[PDB]
Amino acid sequence: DPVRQYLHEIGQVPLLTLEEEIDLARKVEEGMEAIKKLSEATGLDQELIREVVRAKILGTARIQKIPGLKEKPDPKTVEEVDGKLKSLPKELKRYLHIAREGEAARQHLIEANL
Amino acid sequence: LPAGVDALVKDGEEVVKGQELAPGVVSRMDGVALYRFPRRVRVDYLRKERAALRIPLSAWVEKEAYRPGEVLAELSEPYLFRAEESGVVELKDLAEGHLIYLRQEEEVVARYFLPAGMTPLVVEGEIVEVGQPLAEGKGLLRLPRHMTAKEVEAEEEGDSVHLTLFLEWTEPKDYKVAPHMNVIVPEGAKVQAGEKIVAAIDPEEEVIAEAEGVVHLHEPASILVV
């Protein structure tokens, strides 16, 4: 049953009070600015690596594999961006995790307000 | 867990099933629990001084390294701690013991230490002089338990022996976190003097270390084991 479905799916995950809320928003903005920070690392647009985060986050093979017959394929226009910034010192490789956790926290806060 | 409830087990520590994490918190699994939005962070700062101590050798315990609780001398009969300098005093209460800052005009002419049970005979900032019984021990007078004495300094004139000391102690202070705040530095970490501790909304609420300290997390809003 589709009606009860969504209601029982969102009723699974709780809400967010001021603590969690403010925190989450802060996480998201930190990930964003982290992306802008790494946008000068290899010279990649803030939106580019941003979606490059999705490749390993909200699905592995399912985000770019079928947005039509053509999009940004995993081996070609993705992989060379995943293993590019992959060799950078601490002061860079940290913003990666900042963006990972920010990107996740985004979806999180969304689910919370669903 | 409700406010005021503190978590016994430290952050990032193994937790067995059933083991208490707090007064009413009972673990349901074996894993590593983590603090979530700690509502208070206690930082104990380190403070160092080279004090001068004068005690009769007849009763003095001769020791290079005095740790907290390590018994400091003996003092057969109650001994007056005699001033070697004139100036404006001061009284720093160190837990059980004290500290005298003797300063002519502004700057100090010397630094003085009072062991546990050695009582101040002079008001802070009081007019005093040399040859004056600054403190007095009743005997015993072990080193304070919040302070370590490194690097003893040995010198003697005869009966009353004068030893300078290298003193390292701690002064703990608490910081109660707010919803507009979040912990930055990890639990149980060496912390630089003058650094950001807990990031907040305005830079004002942000916690900035007053000296070289250590960081400790306490009574978080909630904790969960994985």
Q: Are strands B119-120 and B133-137 parallel, antiparallel or unpaired?
A: antiparallel
A22 lies within 8 A of chain B by CB: yes
β-pair partners for B208: B196
Q: Residue B97, class by beta-carbon neighbours within 10 Å (0-12 exposed, 13-18 middle, 19+ buried)?
A: buried
**Residue B180 with chain A: CB contacts under 8 Å:** 22
How crowded is residue A24: how many other Cβ atoms within 10 Å of its Cβ?
Answer: 20
Alpha-carbon dihedral sign for residues A32, A37, A38, A42: positive
Token readout for B42 is 């206690």
CA distance B180 to chain A (A): 7
Tell me if A23 and B37 make a contact (CB, 8 A cut-off). Answer: yes
- Radius of gyration from C-alpha coordinates of chain B: 23
Q: Is B184 on the interface with A (CB under 8 A)?
A: no
Cα A51–chain centre separation: 7
Instruction: Looking at A1-114, list the stretches that DSSP marks H as alpha helix, in order from N- to C-terminal side.
Output: 2-10, 18-38, 48-54, 79-82, 90-113
CA-based R_g, chain A, Å: 16
Q: Which residue has the tokens 């994490």?
A: B21
Determination technique used = X-ray
- Chain A contact for B48 (CB, 8 A cutoff): no
Using a CB–CB cutoff of 8 Å, tell me whether B110 touches chain A: no
The full set of domain ranges for chain B reads 1-226
Chain B: closest CA distance from residue A30 (Å): 12
Neighbours of B98 (CB within 10 A): 22
Alpha-carbon distance B182 to nearest alpha carbon in chain A (angstroms): 7
> Could you tell me the CA-to-CA distances from B80 to A29, A35, A61, B116, B196 in Å, in that order?
64, 68, 82, 14, 46
| Contacts for B208 with CB less than 8 Å, ≥ 6 apart | B194, B195, B196, B197
- Beta strands (DSSP E) in B17-159 are 31-49, 52-56, 79-82, 87-88, 91-94, 97-103, 108-114, 119-120, 127-128, 133-137, 147-156
Whether residue B179 and residue A19 make contact (CB cut-off 8 A), yes or no, is yes
- Say yes or no: A23 contacts chain B, CB-CB below 8 A: yes
Position A44: which residue type? L
- Distance CA(A79)–CA(B180), nearest Å, equals 39
Task: Provide the domain limits for residue A79.
Answer: 1-114
Q: Resolution in A, one decimal?
A: 4.6
CB of B179 within 8 Å of any CB in chain A? Answer: yes
Orientation of helix A18-38 relative to helix A90-113, angle to 10°: 140
CATH code at A85? 1.20.120.1810
Domain count of the fold of chain A: 1
Type of residue found at A48: L
Query: Helix, strand, coil shares of chain B as percentages rounded to 5?
Result: 0, 50, 50
Phi, then psi, of A107 in degrees rounded to 5: -50, -40
* Number of inter-chain CB pairs under 8 A, A vs B: 11
B40: distance to nearest CA of chain A, Å? 14
Residue B48 region by backbone torsions, left for phi larger than 0, else alpha for psi between -120 and 50, else beta: beta
| Cβ-based contacts of B37 with chain A (< 8 Å) | 19-20, 23
* DSSP for residue A107: H
Strands B198-200 and B181-183: antiparallel
| Angle formed at CA A67 by CA A66 and CA A71, multiple of 5 degrees | 100
> Do the chains contact at A22 and B179, CB–CB below 8 Å?
yes
Q: SS3 for B38?
A: strand
DSSP A108: H
Decide: B33 and B224 in contact? Cβ < 8 Å: yes
CA B43 to CA B58: how far, in whole Å? 41
CA distance B58 to A28: 69
Minimal-distance CA residue of chain B relative to A22: B180
Distance (Å, rounded) from C-alpha B169 to C-alpha B211?
13
For residue B109, give every residue at least 6 positions away whose Cβ sits within 8 Å of its Cβ, in sequence order, or none: B85, B86, B87, B102, B103
Q: Which letter does DSSP use for residue B186 in this model?
A: P
Q: What is the rounded CA–CA span in Å between residue A86 and residue A81?
A: 9
Phi, psi of B174 (to 5 degrees): -110, 155
Tell me the HSE value of B83 on the side-chain side, using a 13 A CA sphere.
Answer: 22
Kindly state the tokens that stand for A47. Answer: 């939106």
Neighbours of B25 (CB within 10 A): 19
Which residue has 């894993």 as its token pair? B31
CB B204 within 8 A of CB B36: no
CA distances from residue A33 to A85, B32, B55, B57, B87 in whole angstroms, order as listed: 16, 31, 62, 66, 57
